Design a protein around this nucleic acid. Structure first.
Ligand SMILES: [Zn+2]
Ligand SMILES: [Zn+2]
Ligand SMILES: [Zn+2]
Length: 85
DNA sequence: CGACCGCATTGGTCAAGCG
DNA sequence: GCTTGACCAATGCGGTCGC
């Protein structure tokens, strides 16, 4: 009840197995409300949420896409990939 | 051009810690 | 049992530099 049905890795914390398993089945239920980011770990999505704005720092929003960033240096990454026009 | 180099972000991993 | 976050390496970029 603790081993991966797909490759047989053995987990002593079974919750680790339920997350690992999605590496095979591709399920990504933790979906960001701010972008199309998704992941198989609740931990990761909250960590990714920092990238959308810190509490004490000035936030940067996409002028086209209303999307908020905390660091400018990844906004234009979103400009190039999503706003080529 | 190609190969280095700093950074913001990430995927994988793990297990303390809970009460 | 289950959540949470630290850790690490990988990534990808943008830029730099190289008998
Ligand atoms: Zn597996
Ligand atoms: Zn997001
Ligand atoms: Zn945008």
């Amino acid at each position: 009840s603790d081993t991966c049905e797909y490759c047989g890795k053995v987990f002593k914390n079974c919750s680790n197995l339920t997350v690992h398993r999605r590496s095979h089945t591709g399920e990504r239920p933790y979906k960001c409300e701010l972008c199309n980011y998704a992941c198989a770990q609740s931990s990761k999505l909250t960590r990714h949420m920092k990238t959308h704005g810190q509490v004490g720092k000035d936030v940067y929003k996409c002028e086209i896409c209303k999307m908020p960033f905390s660091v400018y240096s990844t906004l234009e990454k979103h400009m190039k990939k999503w706003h080529s026009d």
